Amino acid sequence: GSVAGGWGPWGPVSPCPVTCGLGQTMEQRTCNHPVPQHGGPFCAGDATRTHICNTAVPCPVDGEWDSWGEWSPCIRRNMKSISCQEIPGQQSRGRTCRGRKFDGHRCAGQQQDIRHCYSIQHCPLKGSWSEWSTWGLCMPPCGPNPTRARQRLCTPLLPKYPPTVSMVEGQGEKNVTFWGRPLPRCEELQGQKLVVEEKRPCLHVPACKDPEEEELAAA
Amino acid sequence: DPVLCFTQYEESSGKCKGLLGGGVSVEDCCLNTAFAYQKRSGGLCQPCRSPRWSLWSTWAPCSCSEGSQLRYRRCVGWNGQCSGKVAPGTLEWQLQACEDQQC
Amino acid sequence: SNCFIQKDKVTLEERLDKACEPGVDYVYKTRLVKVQLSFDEYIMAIEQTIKSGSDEVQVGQQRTFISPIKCREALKLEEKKHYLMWGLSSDFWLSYIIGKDTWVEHWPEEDECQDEENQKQCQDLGAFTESMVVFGCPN
Ligand SMILES: *[C@@H]1O[C@@H](C)[C@@H](O)[C@@H](O[C@@H]2O[C@H](CO)[C@@H](O)[C@H](O)[C@H]2O)[C@@H]1O
Ligand SMILES: *[C@@H]1O[C@H](CO)[C@@H](O)[C@H](O)[C@H]1NC(C)=O
Ligand SMILES: *[C@H]1O[C@H](CO)[C@@H](O)[C@H](O)[C@@H]1O
Ligand SMILES: *[C@H]1O[C@H](CO)[C@@H](O)[C@H](O)[C@@H]1O
Ligand SMILES: *[C@H]1O[C@H](CO)[C@@H](O)[C@H](O)[C@@H]1O
Ligand SMILES: *[C@H]1O[C@H](CO)[C@@H](O)[C@H](O)[C@@H]1O
Ligand SMILES: *[C@H]1O[C@H](CO)[C@@H](O)[C@H](O)[C@@H]1O
Ligand SMILES: *[C@H]1O[C@H](CO)[C@@H](O)[C@H](O)[C@@H]1O
Ligand SMILES: *[C@H]1O[C@H](CO)[C@@H](O)[C@H](O)[C@@H]1O
Ligand SMILES: *[C@H]1O[C@H](CO)[C@@H](O)[C@H](O)[C@@H]1O
Protein backbone atom coordinates (compact mmCIF):
# COMPACT_ATOMS: atom_id res chain seq x y z
CA GLY A 1 0.00 0.00 0.00
CA SER A 2 2.31 2.78 -1.43
CA VAL A 3 4.88 2.57 1.47
CA ALA A 4 8.06 4.64 0.67
CA GLY A 5 11.50 3.08 1.37
CA GLY A 6 13.58 3.95 4.48
CA TRP A 7 17.34 3.42 5.06
CA GLY A 8 18.46 0.86 7.68
CA PRO A 9 21.73 1.46 9.61
CA TRP A 10 25.27 1.76 8.14
CA GLY A 11 27.44 -1.36 8.68
CA PRO A 12 31.00 -2.09 7.46
CA VAL A 13 31.58 -4.17 4.26
CA SER A 14 35.40 -4.09 3.72
CA PRO A 15 38.57 -4.45 5.86
CA CYS A 16 41.09 -1.64 6.65
CA PRO A 17 43.36 -1.63 3.57
CA VAL A 18 46.54 -0.14 5.25
CA THR A 19 49.30 -1.53 7.59
CA CYS A 20 49.89 1.89 9.35
CA GLY A 21 48.04 5.21 9.98
CA LEU A 22 44.52 6.06 8.70
CA GLY A 23 42.91 4.32 5.68
CA GLN A 24 39.53 4.06 3.92
CA THR A 25 36.97 1.26 4.45
CA MET A 26 33.44 1.10 2.91
CA GLU A 27 30.12 1.14 4.82
CA GLN A 28 26.80 -0.01 3.25
CA ARG A 29 23.09 0.16 4.22
CA THR A 30 19.90 -1.46 2.87
CA CYS A 31 16.55 0.25 1.93
CA ASN A 32 14.67 -2.12 4.34
CA HIS A 33 13.58 0.31 7.16
CA PRO A 34 11.03 0.10 5.79
CA VAL A 35 11.10 -1.82 2.44
CA PRO A 36 9.32 0.04 -0.40
CA GLN A 37 5.95 -1.74 -1.18
CA HIS A 38 3.09 -1.25 -3.76
CA GLY A 39 4.79 1.40 -6.00
CA GLY A 40 6.52 2.96 -2.96
CA PRO A 41 9.64 4.96 -3.99
CA PHE A 42 13.20 3.61 -3.50
CA CYS A 43 15.27 5.43 -0.79
CA ALA A 44 16.95 8.79 -1.73
CA GLY A 45 20.81 9.01 -1.78
CA ASP A 46 23.63 6.46 -1.33
CA ALA A 47 23.64 2.81 -0.17
CA THR A 48 27.47 3.03 0.31
CA ARG A 49 29.91 5.61 1.80
CA THR A 50 33.64 5.78 2.72
CA HIS A 51 34.64 5.55 6.41
CA ILE A 52 38.08 6.11 8.05
CA CYS A 53 39.81 3.07 9.75
CA ASN A 54 42.61 3.86 12.31
CA THR A 55 45.49 1.34 12.80
CA ALA A 56 46.93 3.73 15.48
CA VAL A 57 50.34 2.41 14.17
CA PRO A 58 52.84 5.04 12.90
CA CYS A 59 54.17 4.68 9.29
CA PRO A 60 57.95 4.70 8.56
CA VAL A 61 59.47 8.23 8.19
CA ASP A 62 62.48 8.59 5.80
CA GLY A 63 65.38 10.75 7.11
CA GLU A 64 66.10 14.28 5.76
CA TRP A 65 69.47 16.16 5.90
CA ASP A 66 69.36 19.33 8.04
CA SER A 67 71.49 22.13 6.45
CA TRP A 68 75.36 22.26 6.76
CA GLY A 69 76.82 23.52 10.09
CA GLU A 70 79.60 26.18 10.11
CA TRP A 71 83.13 25.33 8.82
CA SER A 72 85.34 24.16 11.74
CA PRO A 73 88.47 26.23 12.55
CA CYS A 74 91.12 26.16 9.76
CA ILE A 75 94.02 24.05 11.20
CA ARG A 76 96.89 21.68 10.28
CA ARG A 77 98.24 18.64 12.22
CA ASN A 78 101.44 19.29 14.30
CA MET A 79 100.97 23.14 14.01
CA LYS A 80 99.60 25.21 17.01
CA SER A 81 98.45 27.99 14.59
CA ILE A 82 98.71 28.58 10.79
CA SER A 83 96.78 31.91 10.83
CA CYS A 84 98.51 34.91 9.10
CA GLN A 85 100.81 32.47 7.16
CA GLU A 86 101.00 30.99 3.61
CA ILE A 87 100.16 27.52 5.10
CA PRO A 88 97.26 25.42 3.73
CA GLY A 89 94.97 24.11 6.52
CA GLN A 90 92.00 21.72 6.63
CA GLN A 91 88.45 22.30 7.98
CA SER A 92 85.14 20.40 7.85
CA ARG A 93 81.39 20.97 8.33
CA GLY A 94 78.76 18.28 9.10
CA ARG A 95 74.97 17.73 8.91
CA THR A 96 72.61 15.23 10.70
CA CYS A 97 70.04 12.88 9.09
CA ARG A 98 66.99 14.00 11.20
CA GLY A 99 63.43 12.57 11.26
CA ARG A 100 64.15 8.86 10.50
CA LYS A 101 61.68 6.66 12.51
CA PHE A 102 60.09 3.14 12.46
CA ASP A 103 62.52 1.57 9.88
CA GLY A 104 62.19 4.50 7.41
CA HIS A 105 65.05 5.10 4.91
CA ARG A 106 68.47 6.69 5.71
CA CYS A 107 69.63 9.94 3.98
CA ALA A 108 71.55 9.79 0.62
CA GLY A 109 75.18 11.06 0.25
CA GLN A 110 77.75 12.63 2.60
CA GLN A 111 77.33 13.67 6.30
CA GLN A 112 80.76 15.53 6.13
CA ASP A 113 82.21 18.19 3.73
CA ILE A 114 86.05 18.72 3.87
CA ARG A 115 88.05 21.60 2.28
CA HIS A 116 91.50 23.30 2.65
CA CYS A 117 92.03 26.91 3.71
CA TYR A 118 94.32 29.86 4.48
CA SER A 119 93.52 31.16 8.05
CA ILE A 120 93.35 34.99 8.29
CA GLN A 121 91.38 34.77 11.60
CA HIS A 122 92.24 37.96 13.62
CA CYS A 123 95.04 38.72 11.01
CA PRO A 124 95.75 42.46 10.50
CA LEU A 125 95.45 43.21 6.72
CA LYS A 126 95.59 46.58 4.83
CA GLY A 127 91.95 47.59 4.01
CA SER A 128 90.34 49.42 1.02
CA TRP A 129 86.80 50.88 1.42
CA SER A 130 84.04 49.29 -0.72
CA GLU A 131 81.87 51.80 -2.62
CA TRP A 132 78.22 51.91 -1.29
CA SER A 133 76.39 48.55 -0.86
CA THR A 134 72.97 48.29 -2.58
CA TRP A 135 70.10 49.46 -0.26
CA GLY A 136 69.10 46.70 2.23
CA LEU A 137 65.51 45.64 3.14
CA CYS A 138 63.08 47.89 5.09
CA MET A 139 63.25 46.93 8.82
CA PRO A 140 61.28 46.10 10.79
CA PRO A 141 59.23 44.86 7.78
CA CYS A 142 55.88 45.10 9.72
CA GLY A 143 56.77 46.92 13.02
CA PRO A 144 56.72 50.77 13.14
CA ASN A 145 58.91 53.32 11.21
CA PRO A 146 60.56 50.90 8.68
CA THR A 147 64.11 52.12 7.72
CA ARG A 148 66.52 51.01 4.92
CA ALA A 149 70.41 51.05 4.96
CA ARG A 150 73.59 50.73 2.80
CA GLN A 151 77.30 50.53 3.83
CA ARG A 152 80.89 51.32 2.84
CA LEU A 153 82.89 48.45 4.51
CA CYS A 154 86.64 48.49 5.33
CA THR A 155 87.26 45.59 2.88
CA PRO A 156 90.54 43.63 3.39
CA LEU A 157 93.23 43.05 0.66
CA LEU A 158 93.81 39.23 0.71
CA PRO A 159 97.43 38.03 0.31
CA LYS A 160 98.18 37.11 -3.37
CA TYR A 161 98.39 33.36 -2.44
CA PRO A 162 98.01 30.38 -4.81
CA PRO A 163 94.37 29.34 -5.47
CA THR A 164 95.54 25.66 -5.12
CA VAL A 165 97.98 23.39 -3.13
CA SER A 166 99.81 20.33 -4.61
CA MET A 167 98.90 17.02 -2.86
CA VAL A 168 101.55 14.59 -1.39
CA GLU A 169 99.88 11.26 -2.48
CA GLY A 170 98.16 11.94 -5.87
CA GLN A 171 99.56 13.71 -8.98
CA GLY A 172 96.60 16.04 -8.13
CA GLU A 173 95.95 19.48 -6.54
CA LYS A 174 93.30 20.84 -4.06
CA ASN A 175 91.54 24.27 -3.77
CA VAL A 176 92.52 26.49 -0.77
CA THR A 177 89.89 29.08 0.39
CA PHE A 178 90.71 32.02 2.76
CA TRP A 179 88.76 31.45 6.06
CA GLY A 180 88.45 33.61 9.24
CA ARG A 181 87.47 37.19 10.29
CA PRO A 182 90.61 39.35 9.72
CA LEU A 183 91.35 42.91 11.07
CA PRO A 184 91.24 45.23 8.01
CA ARG A 185 93.31 48.46 8.52
CA CYS A 186 91.75 51.43 6.58
CA GLU A 187 92.52 55.14 7.08
CA GLU A 188 89.29 56.77 8.49
CA LEU A 189 86.42 57.46 6.02
CA GLN A 190 83.81 59.82 7.68
CA GLY A 191 85.88 59.38 10.90
CA GLN A 192 85.14 55.58 10.91
CA LYS A 193 87.66 52.64 10.75
CA LEU A 194 85.27 49.66 9.87
CA VAL A 195 81.73 50.65 8.64
CA VAL A 196 79.98 53.86 7.34
CA GLU A 197 76.13 53.38 7.36
CA GLU A 198 73.45 55.68 5.75
CA LYS A 199 69.70 55.18 6.58
CA ARG A 200 66.47 56.59 5.03
CA PRO A 201 62.76 55.81 5.70
CA CYS A 202 60.62 53.48 3.50
CA LEU A 203 57.69 55.27 1.81
CA HIS A 204 53.95 54.34 1.75
CA VAL A 205 54.50 50.99 3.58
CA PRO A 206 51.55 48.54 3.56
CA ALA A 207 50.44 46.71 6.77
CA CYS A 208 51.35 42.98 6.95
CA LYS A 209 47.95 41.23 6.38
CA ASP A 210 47.70 37.37 6.59
CA PRO A 211 46.82 36.03 3.07
CA GLU A 212 44.50 33.41 4.74
CA GLU A 213 42.33 36.19 6.36
CA GLU A 214 42.86 38.99 3.72
CA GLU A 215 40.02 39.60 1.16
CA LEU A 216 37.55 38.80 3.99
CA ALA A 217 37.49 42.62 4.56
CA ALA A 218 33.83 43.76 4.14
CA ALA A 219 35.03 46.70 6.34
CA ASP B 1 39.62 18.75 18.13
CA PRO B 2 38.92 17.25 14.70
CA VAL B 3 40.46 18.04 11.26
CA LEU B 4 39.99 17.18 7.56
CA CYS B 5 42.61 14.49 6.65
CA PHE B 6 43.99 14.36 3.05
CA THR B 7 46.41 11.80 1.51
CA GLN B 8 48.43 14.29 -0.64
CA TYR B 9 50.11 17.71 -0.14
CA GLU B 10 50.80 19.48 -3.49
CA GLU B 11 53.99 21.58 -2.90
CA SER B 12 53.50 23.66 -6.15
CA SER B 13 50.13 25.22 -4.96
CA GLY B 14 50.18 24.33 -1.19
CA LYS B 15 46.81 22.52 -1.72
CA CYS B 16 45.42 19.46 0.21
CA LYS B 17 44.25 16.62 -2.20
CA GLY B 18 42.72 13.12 -1.74
CA LEU B 19 40.15 13.61 1.10
CA LEU B 20 39.98 10.60 3.51
CA GLY B 21 37.41 12.29 5.78
CA GLY B 22 37.00 14.40 8.94
CA GLY B 23 36.35 13.69 12.64
CA VAL B 24 40.06 12.79 13.23
CA SER B 25 42.81 14.32 15.42
CA VAL B 26 45.81 15.83 13.54
CA GLU B 27 47.96 13.28 15.50
CA ASP B 28 45.98 10.38 13.88
CA CYS B 29 45.94 12.02 10.42
CA CYS B 30 49.74 12.67 10.56
CA LEU B 31 50.57 9.05 11.75
CA ASN B 32 51.41 8.96 7.98
CA THR B 33 53.71 12.02 7.31
CA ALA B 34 52.81 11.96 3.52
CA PHE B 35 49.28 13.23 4.53
CA ALA B 36 47.99 16.81 5.03
CA TYR B 37 45.15 18.50 6.98
CA GLN B 38 42.82 21.53 7.15
CA LYS B 39 41.33 22.71 10.51
CA ARG B 40 38.26 24.16 8.61
CA SER B 41 37.04 23.87 4.94
CA GLY B 42 38.63 26.89 3.13
CA GLY B 43 41.37 27.05 5.82
CA LEU B 44 45.15 26.81 5.18
CA CYS B 45 46.48 23.32 4.28
CA GLN B 46 49.38 21.99 6.48
CA PRO B 47 51.48 18.95 5.39
CA CYS B 48 52.09 16.16 7.99
CA ARG B 49 55.86 16.10 7.12
CA SER B 50 58.42 17.94 9.33
CA PRO B 51 58.31 21.73 9.06
CA ARG B 52 60.25 23.84 6.51
CA TRP B 53 59.85 27.32 4.91
CA SER B 54 57.57 27.91 1.88
CA LEU B 55 59.25 29.73 -1.04
CA TRP B 56 58.92 33.56 -0.80
CA SER B 57 55.76 34.98 -2.50
CA THR B 58 56.23 37.36 -5.49
CA TRP B 59 56.68 41.05 -4.45
CA ALA B 60 53.17 42.60 -3.94
CA PRO B 61 51.99 45.77 -5.80
CA CYS B 62 54.18 48.89 -5.05
CA SER B 63 51.25 51.30 -4.15
CA CYS B 64 54.36 55.98 -10.09
CA SER B 65 56.67 57.49 -7.34
CA GLU B 66 58.89 55.30 -5.04
CA GLY B 67 56.81 53.35 -2.43
CA SER B 68 57.39 49.92 -0.78
CA GLN B 69 56.12 46.29 -1.32
CA LEU B 70 55.86 43.11 0.89
CA ARG B 71 56.70 39.48 0.17
CA TYR B 72 56.04 36.65 2.69
CA ARG B 73 56.73 32.97 3.34
CA ARG B 74 55.23 30.55 5.91
CA CYS B 75 56.59 27.69 8.05
CA VAL B 76 54.57 24.71 6.64
CA GLY B 77 54.59 21.20 8.20
CA TRP B 78 53.91 19.39 11.51
CA ASN B 79 55.75 18.30 14.72
CA GLY B 80 58.87 20.54 14.56
CA GLN B 81 60.21 24.08 13.96
CA CYS B 82 61.64 26.06 10.99
CA SER B 83 65.06 27.88 11.07
CA GLY B 84 64.73 30.41 13.98
CA LYS B 85 62.77 27.88 16.17
CA VAL B 86 59.56 29.12 14.38
CA ALA B 87 56.29 27.14 15.04
CA PRO B 88 54.24 25.81 12.06
CA GLY B 89 51.79 28.41 10.63
CA THR B 90 54.10 31.39 11.25
CA LEU B 91 54.41 34.01 8.47
CA GLU B 92 57.74 35.86 8.00
CA TRP B 93 57.89 39.15 6.00
CA GLN B 94 60.27 41.28 3.86
CA LEU B 95 59.59 44.98 2.95
CA GLN B 96 61.36 46.73 0.02
CA ALA B 97 61.64 50.16 -1.72
CA CYS B 98 60.04 49.91 -5.23
CA GLU B 99 59.64 52.21 -8.34
CA ASP B 100 56.92 51.70 -11.06
CA GLN B 101 57.48 54.74 -13.41
CA GLN B 102 58.40 58.39 -12.45
CA CYS B 103 55.30 60.73 -12.22
CA SER C 1 97.82 -7.95 22.97
CA ASN C 2 100.57 -8.81 20.40
CA CYS C 3 97.79 -9.63 17.79
CA PHE C 4 97.36 -5.99 16.60
CA ILE C 5 97.60 -2.42 18.08
CA GLN C 6 94.95 -2.90 20.86
CA LYS C 7 93.38 0.54 21.72
CA ASP C 8 90.73 5.76 26.46
CA LYS C 9 89.38 5.62 22.82
CA VAL C 10 91.39 6.79 19.73
CA THR C 11 91.30 10.50 18.69
CA LEU C 12 92.00 12.11 15.26
CA GLU C 13 95.29 13.69 16.59
CA GLU C 14 96.21 10.22 18.08
CA ARG C 15 95.51 8.42 14.75
CA LEU C 16 97.52 10.98 12.64
CA ASP C 17 100.51 10.55 15.08
CA LYS C 18 100.59 6.67 15.08
CA ALA C 19 100.29 6.36 11.24
CA CYS C 20 103.40 8.64 10.97
CA GLU C 21 105.62 6.62 13.41
CA PRO C 22 108.94 5.34 11.96
CA GLY C 23 108.71 2.30 9.61
CA VAL C 24 104.92 2.75 8.86
CA ASP C 25 105.22 2.17 5.05
CA TYR C 26 101.52 1.53 4.08
CA VAL C 27 98.11 2.97 5.07
CA TYR C 28 95.13 1.38 3.21
CA LYS C 29 91.34 1.66 3.20
CA THR C 30 90.42 -2.02 2.47
CA ARG C 31 87.31 -4.21 1.86
CA LEU C 32 87.55 -7.83 3.22
CA VAL C 33 86.64 -9.66 -0.08
CA LYS C 34 86.93 -13.24 1.39
CA VAL C 35 88.29 -14.98 4.55
CA GLN C 36 90.02 -18.40 4.22
CA LEU C 37 90.63 -19.81 7.79
CA SER C 38 93.06 -22.70 8.74
CA PHE C 39 97.48 -19.25 9.99
CA ASP C 40 94.37 -17.40 8.58
CA GLU C 41 94.68 -15.67 5.11
CA TYR C 42 92.40 -12.53 4.95
CA ILE C 43 91.97 -11.55 1.23
CA MET C 44 91.78 -7.68 1.20
CA ALA C 45 90.85 -5.47 -1.81
CA ILE C 46 92.53 -1.99 -1.72
CA GLU C 47 89.97 0.90 -2.03
CA GLN C 48 92.44 3.77 -1.22
CA THR C 49 96.27 4.03 -1.07
CA ILE C 50 96.18 6.57 1.84
CA LYS C 51 100.01 6.06 2.13
CA SER C 52 102.00 3.99 -0.46
CA GLY C 53 105.38 2.37 0.36
CA SER C 54 107.70 -0.46 -0.85
CA ASP C 55 104.61 -2.21 -2.41
CA GLU C 56 103.24 -0.14 -5.40
CA VAL C 57 99.59 -1.46 -5.16
CA GLN C 58 97.11 -0.14 -7.80
CA VAL C 59 93.63 0.76 -6.39
CA GLY C 60 91.12 -2.14 -6.80
CA GLN C 61 93.91 -4.81 -6.40
CA GLN C 62 94.04 -7.55 -3.66
CA ARG C 63 96.60 -8.49 -0.92
CA THR C 64 96.56 -11.46 1.54
CA PHE C 65 96.86 -10.53 5.26
CA ILE C 66 98.15 -13.50 7.40
CA SER C 67 97.41 -13.79 11.20
CA PRO C 68 97.98 -16.62 13.77
CA ILE C 69 95.00 -18.91 14.72
CA LYS C 70 95.49 -17.44 18.28
CA CYS C 71 94.51 -13.94 16.97
CA ARG C 72 91.28 -14.79 14.95
CA GLU C 73 88.78 -14.11 17.87
CA ALA C 74 90.51 -10.76 18.81
CA LEU C 75 90.63 -9.43 15.17
CA LYS C 76 86.93 -10.43 14.63
CA LEU C 77 87.07 -9.57 10.86
CA GLU C 78 83.71 -10.11 8.98
CA GLU C 79 83.56 -10.43 5.12
CA LYS C 80 82.46 -7.45 2.84
CA LYS C 81 83.33 -5.01 5.74
CA HIS C 82 85.80 -2.08 5.34
CA TYR C 83 88.94 -1.48 7.51
CA LEU C 84 91.65 1.19 7.99
CA MET C 85 94.98 -0.72 7.99
CA TRP C 86 98.65 0.34 8.44
CA GLY C 87 101.85 -1.49 9.50
CA LEU C 88 105.65 -1.65 9.17
CA SER C 89 108.09 -2.45 6.32
CA SER C 90 109.17 -5.34 8.71
CA ASP C 91 105.68 -7.04 8.38
CA PHE C 92 106.09 -7.79 4.58
CA TRP C 93 106.19 -11.48 3.35
CA LEU C 94 103.79 -10.50 -1.75
CA SER C 95 101.52 -10.54 1.39
CA TYR C 96 101.26 -8.75 4.82
CA ILE C 97 101.65 -10.05 8.43
CA ILE C 98 99.31 -8.63 11.10
CA GLY C 99 101.35 -8.20 14.34
CA LYS C 100 101.62 -5.97 17.48
CA ASP C 101 102.56 -2.97 15.19
CA THR C 102 99.55 -3.37 12.77
CA TRP C 103 96.53 -0.97 12.93
CA VAL C 104 93.20 -2.68 12.04
CA GLU C 105 90.12 -0.42 12.60
CA HIS C 106 86.52 -1.27 11.57
CA TRP C 107 85.45 1.50 9.10
CA PRO C 108 81.61 1.83 9.26
CA GLU C 109 79.62 1.60 5.96
CA GLU C 110 78.63 5.05 4.54
CA ASP C 111 74.90 4.47 5.52
CA GLU C 112 75.61 3.37 9.17
CA CYS C 113 77.96 6.43 9.73
CA GLN C 114 74.71 8.49 10.21
CA ASP C 115 74.04 6.42 13.41
CA GLU C 116 74.89 8.56 16.54
CA GLU C 117 77.20 5.73 17.83
CA ASN C 118 79.32 6.12 14.59
CA GLN C 119 79.19 9.86 13.70
CA LYS C 120 82.48 10.86 15.47
CA GLN C 121 84.60 7.92 14.21
CA CYS C 122 83.44 8.45 10.55
CA GLN C 123 84.09 12.23 10.79
CA ASP C 124 87.59 11.44 12.24
CA LEU C 125 88.47 8.86 9.47
CA GLY C 126 87.29 11.22 6.67
CA ALA C 127 89.48 13.98 8.27
CA PHE C 128 92.43 11.56 8.86
CA THR C 129 92.24 10.31 5.25
CA GLU C 130 92.17 13.88 3.77
CA SER C 131 95.07 15.12 6.02
CA MET C 132 97.20 12.07 5.05
CA VAL C 133 96.52 12.22 1.26
CA VAL C 134 97.00 16.06 0.88
CA PHE C 135 99.56 17.02 3.64
CA GLY C 136 101.30 13.64 4.31
CA CYS C 137 103.27 12.94 7.54
CA PRO C 138 105.19 15.72 9.36
CA ASN C 139 109.06 15.74 9.46
C1 LIG D 1 52.48 -2.05 5.88
O1 LIG D 1 53.28 -1.97 7.08
C2 LIG D 1 53.52 -0.63 7.57
C3 LIG D 1 54.37 -0.62 8.84
C4 LIG D 1 54.21 0.15 6.46
O2 LIG D 1 55.42 -0.58 6.17
C5 LIG D 1 53.29 0.23 5.25
O3 LIG D 1 53.91 1.00 4.20
C6 LIG D 1 53.34 2.31 4.06
O4 LIG D 1 52.03 2.29 3.45
C7 LIG D 1 51.45 3.59 3.23
C8 LIG D 1 50.12 3.40 2.54
O5 LIG D 1 49.35 2.57 3.47
C9 LIG D 1 52.39 4.49 2.42
O6 LIG D 1 51.86 5.83 2.27
C10 LIG D 1 53.71 4.54 3.14
O7 LIG D 1 54.61 5.45 2.46
C11 LIG D 1 54.27 3.14 3.20
O8 LIG D 1 55.63 3.18 3.73
C12 LIG D 1 53.05 -1.19 4.74
O9 LIG D 1 52.20 -1.15 3.59
C1 LIG E 1 87.97 24.35 -7.22
O1 LIG E 1 88.14 25.63 -7.84
C2 LIG E 1 87.94 25.58 -9.25
C3 LIG E 1 88.35 26.93 -9.84
O2 LIG E 1 88.74 26.77 -11.22
C4 LIG E 1 86.49 25.18 -9.55
O3 LIG E 1 86.31 24.93 -10.95
C5 LIG E 1 86.07 23.91 -8.80
O4 LIG E 1 84.65 23.77 -8.84
C6 LIG E 1 86.52 23.91 -7.34
N1 LIG E 1 86.30 22.59 -6.76
C7 LIG E 1 85.92 22.40 -5.48
C8 LIG E 1 85.71 20.98 -5.03
O5 LIG E 1 85.75 23.33 -4.72
C1 LIG F 1 18.09 7.45 3.78
O1 LIG F 1 19.08 8.47 3.58
C2 LIG F 1 18.80 9.69 4.29
C3 LIG F 1 19.07 9.54 5.79
O2 LIG F 1 20.47 9.37 5.99
C4 LIG F 1 17.39 10.19 3.99
O3 LIG F 1 17.42 10.67 2.64
C5 LIG F 1 16.29 9.12 4.11
O4 LIG F 1 16.05 8.67 5.45
C6 LIG F 1 16.71 7.90 3.31
O5 LIG F 1 15.72 6.88 3.51
C1 LIG G 1 25.14 5.76 9.52
O1 LIG G 1 25.77 7.02 9.81
C2 LIG G 1 25.56 7.56 11.14
C3 LIG G 1 26.32 6.76 12.19
O2 LIG G 1 27.70 6.76 11.83
C4 LIG G 1 24.07 7.63 11.45
O3 LIG G 1 23.45 8.55 10.52
C5 LIG G 1 23.38 6.27 11.26
O4 LIG G 1 23.80 5.28 12.20
C6 LIG G 1 23.65 5.79 9.84
O5 LIG G 1 23.10 4.49 9.66
C1 LIG H 1 74.98 23.01 2.67
O1 LIG H 1 75.68 23.54 1.53
C2 LIG H 1 75.05 24.63 0.81
C3 LIG H 1 75.15 25.96 1.54
O2 LIG H 1 76.53 26.37 1.54
C4 LIG H 1 73.62 24.26 0.45
O3 LIG H 1 73.74 23.23 -0.53
C5 LIG H 1 72.81 23.73 1.64
O4 LIG H 1 72.63 24.78 2.59
C6 LIG H 1 73.56 22.59 2.30
O5 LIG H 1 72.87 22.20 3.48
C1 LIG I 1 82.19 28.20 5.88
O1 LIG I 1 82.71 29.09 4.88
C2 LIG I 1 82.22 30.45 4.85
C3 LIG I 1 82.80 31.26 5.99
O2 LIG I 1 84.21 31.24 5.78
C4 LIG I 1 80.69 30.43 4.84
O3 LIG I 1 80.30 29.73 3.65
C5 LIG I 1 80.11 29.64 5.99
O4 LIG I 1 80.48 30.22 7.23
C6 LIG I 1 80.66 28.23 5.93
O5 LIG I 1 80.29 27.60 7.15
C1 LIG J 1 78.13 55.70 -3.15
O1 LIG J 1 77.43 56.90 -3.52
C2 LIG J 1 77.42 57.22 -4.91
C3 LIG J 1 76.05 56.83 -5.44
O2 LIG J 1 75.92 55.41 -5.48
C4 LIG J 1 78.56 56.62 -5.76
O3 LIG J 1 79.26 57.70 -6.38
C5 LIG J 1 79.65 55.78 -5.06
O4 LIG J 1 79.48 54.41 -5.45
C6 LIG J 1 79.60 55.84 -3.55
O5 LIG J 1 80.43 54.80 -3.01
C1 LIG K 1 69.34 51.97 -3.40
O1 LIG K 1 68.31 52.75 -4.03
C2 LIG K 1 67.91 52.42 -5.37
C3 LIG K 1 67.06 51.15 -5.38
O2 LIG K 1 66.10 51.16 -4.31
C4 LIG K 1 69.12 52.33 -6.30
O3 LIG K 1 69.45 53.66 -6.71
C5 LIG K 1 70.39 51.68 -5.70
O4 LIG K 1 70.37 50.25 -5.90
C6 LIG K 1 70.63 52.02 -4.21
O5 LIG K 1 71.65 51.16 -3.66
C1 LIG L 1 89.22 53.79 2.47
O1 LIG L 1 88.71 54.49 1.34
C2 LIG L 1 88.33 55.87 1.46
C3 LIG L 1 88.30 56.33 0.01
O2 LIG L 1 89.42 55.70 -0.64
C4 LIG L 1 89.32 56.73 2.27
O3 LIG L 1 88.72 57.94 2.73
C5 LIG L 1 89.82 56.01 3.51
O4 LIG L 1 90.85 56.79 4.11
C6 LIG L 1 90.32 54.62 3.14
O5 LIG L 1 91.36 54.71 2.17
C1 LIG M 1 63.13 33.46 -0.96
O1 LIG M 1 64.38 34.15 -1.14
C2 LIG M 1 65.20 33.72 -2.23
C3 LIG M 1 64.60 34.15 -3.57
O2 LIG M 1 64.49 35.58 -3.55
C4 LIG M 1 65.46 32.22 -2.14
O3 LIG M 1 66.47 32.03 -1.15
C5 LIG M 1 64.26 31.37 -1.76
O4 LIG M 1 63.48 31.22 -2.94
C6 LIG M 1 63.39 31.98 -0.67
O5 LIG M 1 62.16 31.24 -0.59
Author numbering:
A (entry chain A): 254 to 472
B (entry chain B): 28 to 90, 93 to 132
C (entry chain C): 1516 to 1522, 1525 to 1555, 1558 to 1612, 1618 to 1663
List passages from the publication reporting this PDB structure.
PN1/456 in complex with C3/C3b-CTC crystallized as long rods and pyramids. While the pyramid-shaped crystals showed poor diffraction, PN1/456-CTC rod-shaped crystals diffracted anisotropically with resolution limits of 2.3–2.7 Å. In PN1/456-CTC, properdin-TSR5 sits on top of the C3/C3b-CTC domain with an ~angle of 20° between the main body of TSR5 and the C3/C3b-CTC C-terminal α-helix. This interface is characterized by mainly hydrophilic interactions, involving TSR5 residues Gln343, Gln363, Gln364, His369, and C3/C3b-CTC residues Gln1638, Gln1643, and Glu1654, and a salt bridge between TSR5 Arg359 and C3/C3b-CTC Asp1639. We identified two “stirrup”-like loops, residues 328–336 of TSR5 and 419–426 of TSR6, which embrace the end of the C-terminal α-helix of CTC. The two “stirrups” provide additional properdin-C3b interactions; the TSR5 stirrup interacts with C3/C3b-CTC through cation-π stacking of Arg329 with C3/C3b Phe1659 and a hydrogen bond between Arg330 and the main-chain oxygen of C3/C3b Gly1660. In the TSR6 stirrup, Lys427 forms a salt bridge with C3/C3b Glu1654. The TSR6 stirrup is partially disordered in the absence of C3/C3b-CTC, but well-defined in the PN1/456-CTC complex. Consistent with low-resolution EM and X-ray data, we have shown that the TSR5 domain of properdin provides the main interaction interface with C3b by binding along the length of the C-terminal α-helix of the C3b α′-chain. Comparison with other structures of C3b indicates that binding of properdin to the CTC domain does not require nor likely induces large conformational changes in C3b.
